[PDB]
Amino acid sequence: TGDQRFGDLVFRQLAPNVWQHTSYLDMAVASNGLIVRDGGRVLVVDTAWTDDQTAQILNWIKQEINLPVALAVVTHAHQNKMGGMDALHAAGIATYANALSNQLAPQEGMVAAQHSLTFAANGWVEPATAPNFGPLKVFYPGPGHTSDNITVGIDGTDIAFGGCLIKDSKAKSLGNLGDADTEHYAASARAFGAAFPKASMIVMSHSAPDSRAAITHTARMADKLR
Ligand SMILES: [Zn+2]
Ligand SMILES: [Zn+2]
């Protein structure tokens, strides 16, 4: 209830101007991103697993929102986040990613975003690299899930997007591979929480939106790794 199926994708409205988009890849693994309505334009966080799935995202937006997609930001260089970059570019959408994500993308078989984000030493995005991001507040919490993994808060809402960094409050593991920073993971998770201290709805890549318990639980799980 509240979920719209659209082809093989699923869309859930989280707020008047925010939807979660979900795509699947058989390895039947879900991956979430965000769609944000900002006045006369749409902003997208993360692609779907594939170009064709991402094109469907844009199809859904055209139908349900009917506003031009101005830009997209992807939160790290893995297929579930950057797999549909070509689809974004073919639609004339300006794309942004961590400079490191763009550096890693060719090795991961991903297409690099058109623009590179860089970050101050306190983790907040450098304003000039993220021009006209509207309500999107982009924060690099430090290495965790990956070295390049970044997070996005939505001003005007209680929503913060933790991507693959944050696991749900009942997650039985962190499901990291070799590119995880198991030393700094805990601190990065907590940095994310501190960057968006008022966010009460935490959106993440691999499960439904959860409370702030997702953040503290993730950090506590990561504490066991150090
Ligand atoms: Zn990942
Ligand atoms: Zn993931």
The CATH number of residue 67's host domain is 3.60.15.10
Strand-pairing partners, residue 10, are 5, 22
Exposed e or buried b for every residue in 68-102, given b needs 16+ CB within 10 A?
ebbbbbbbbbbbbbbbbbbbbbebebbbbbbbbbb
Strand-pairing partners, residue 23, are 31
Backbone dihedral region for residue 14 (phi beyond 0: left; psi -120 to 50: alpha; all else: beta): alpha
Measured in degrees and rounded to the nearest 5, phi and psi for residue 59 equal: -65, -40
Q: Which 8-state DSSP code applies to residue 93?
A: -
DSSP-assigned letters across all residues of 23-77:
EEE---EEEEEEEEEETTEEEEES--SSHHHHHHHHHHHHHHT---EEEEEE-SS
Contact status, residue 52 vs residue 23, Cβ threshold 8 Å: no
Contact status, residue 141 vs residue 123, Cβ threshold 8 Å: yes
Judged by DSSP in three states, 101 sits in helix
Closest ligand to C-alpha of residue 81 is 1
Ligand 2 is a single-atom ion; what residues have CB below 5 A from it?
164, 205
Residue 143 belongs to what domain range? 1-226
- Domain count across the chain: 1
Closest ligand to C-alpha of residue 31 is 2
CA distance 174 to 176: 6
Measured in degrees and rounded to the nearest 5, phi and psi for residue 132 equal: 55, 45
CA of 9 to the centre of ligand 2 (A): 17
CA distance 123 to 93: 26
Q: Is residue 24 exposed (0-12), middle (13-18) or buried (19+ Cβ within 10 Å)?
A: middle
Best CA proximity match to 83, nearest among 109, 120, 59, 102? 109
Judged by DSSP in three states, 128 sits in helix
Closest ligand to C-alpha of residue 74 is 1
Experimental method of this PDB entry: X-ray
CA of 26 to the centre of ligand 2 (A): 14
CA of 151 to the centre of ligand 1 (A): 13
In order of 10, 173, 174, the CA distances from 105 in angstroms are 26, 26, 23
CA of 163 to the centre of ligand 1 (A): 8
Contact status, residue 72 vs residue 152, Cβ threshold 8 Å: no
CA distance 157 to 38: 12
The residue written with tokens 């699923």 in the block is 10
Strand-pairing partners, residue 74, are 97
Best CA proximity match to 4, nearest among 64, 49, 48, 44? 64
Closest ligand to C-alpha of residue 75 is 1
CA of 66 to the centre of ligand 1 (A): 30
CA atoms within 13 A on the CB side of 113: 28
Closest ligand to C-alpha of residue 168 is 2
CA distance 85 to 78: 11
CA distance 102 to 79: 13
Residue 3: count of CB within 10 angstroms of its CB: 12
* Chain centre to alpha carbon of residue 224: 25
